[PDB]
Amino acid sequence: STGSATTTPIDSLDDAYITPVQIGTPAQTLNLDFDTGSSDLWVFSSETTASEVDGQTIYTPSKSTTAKLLSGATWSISYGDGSSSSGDVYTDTVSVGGLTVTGQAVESAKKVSSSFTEDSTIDGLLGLAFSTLNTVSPTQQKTFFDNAKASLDSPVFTADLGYHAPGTYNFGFIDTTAYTGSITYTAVSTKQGFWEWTSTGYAVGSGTFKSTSIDGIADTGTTLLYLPATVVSAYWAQVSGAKSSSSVGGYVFPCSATLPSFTFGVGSARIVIPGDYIDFGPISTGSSSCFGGIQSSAGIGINIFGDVALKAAFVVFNGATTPTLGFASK
Numbered sequence: 001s002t003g004s005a006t007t008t009p010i011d012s013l014d015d016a017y018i019t020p021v022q023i024g025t026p027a028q029t030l031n032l033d034f035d036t037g038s039s040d041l042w043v044f045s046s047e048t049t050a051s052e053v054d055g056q057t058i059y060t061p062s063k064s065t066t067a068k069l070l071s072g073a074t075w076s077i078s079y080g081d082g083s084s085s086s087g088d089v090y091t092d093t094v095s096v097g098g099l100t101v102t103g104q105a106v107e108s109a110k111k112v113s114s115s116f117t118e119d120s121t122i123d124g125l126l127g128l129a130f131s132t133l134n135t136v137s138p139t140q141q142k143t144f145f146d147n148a149k150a151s152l153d154s155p156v157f158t159a160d161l162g163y164h165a166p167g168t169y170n171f172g173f174i175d176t177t178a179y180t181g182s183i184t185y186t187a188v189s190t191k192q193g194f195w196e197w198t199s200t201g202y203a204v205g206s207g208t209f210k211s212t213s214i215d216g217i218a219d220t221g222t223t224l225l226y227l228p229a230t231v232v233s234a235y236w237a238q239v240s241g242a243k244s245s246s247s248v249g250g251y252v253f254p255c256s257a258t259l260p261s262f263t264f265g266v267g268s269a270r271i272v273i274p275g276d277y278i279d280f281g282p283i284s285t286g287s288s289s290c291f292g293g294i295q296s297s298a299g300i301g302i303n304i305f306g307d308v309a310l311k312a313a314f315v316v317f318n319g320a321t322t323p324t325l326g327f328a329s330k
């Protein structure tokens, strides 16, 4: 089997992407944030505290003839950005782009943090990291990809995120029309439950490439590119008037600037992030100070190849017995 779904930016900055997901019988379509940095499929629901729902579409398990309470199961997650959610668990039929899993754990939120409430466009998350991170207790549950894997034509999914435009998540096949040149594959460590890999280095604009190992995660659920402070300082030093602002919480730059590109290595291959991808717009409405799309990871404990990086590439998440990542230009 295969599946193919379009993923759409939630706003004009590509702050996140949403993909429609069918849950239950008859189908209830929710727009989920596909997150290769987490492993829980959770939704706004009929159980969510009423004051914490503000325009999201909810899953109502009582209206699904295939929904079954997973007795005694709870979940609770806290994300790297400080957001959180928790609740109970149903199993139900879940389809993405034509690919159906029966018996998927659908984690129904009873509580969500303010950042979720305040974003009307995201109805929940669909985690695509390794199932070892799933938070369901006392019986850990599998991701949608892990449940689909054995049925797929190939045990893969691909992320093809757009810059200020829709893109695609495919399951079970690699669309050879969706990229240029060849896909370079690189080793993955699953030891922290992430799609963790080692970039071979970077360049700033037309500058010389610096060969250096940068360990990090391929994370579709993180907006920005978070890299070591040395690399980030080297990038922003090429932008007149850019500075790290403790008050704003990262590097800012004059909105009048034209940003340089940023290149990262994948083995001997190179992925070039155009400068425009690194502009996250005014820090506050009407400001001439703009927020940067490349930020330090120093305060995180891991480097994160988030959407800024991944949207410059066609990315293969290869769930073969030994997982690997593939990157192509496009």
Ligand SMILES: CCNCCOc1ccc(OCc2ccccc2)cc1
Residues within 6 Å of the ligand: 015, 016, 033, 035, 037, 038, 079, 080, 081, 083, 115, 116, 119, 122, 221, 222, 223
């Ligand atoms: C650790 C990162 N990845 C997992 C958490 O992913 C989130 C997704 C959405 C969200 O909603 C608020 C929001 C949306 C867009 C950009 C900034 C913040 C919070 C967290």
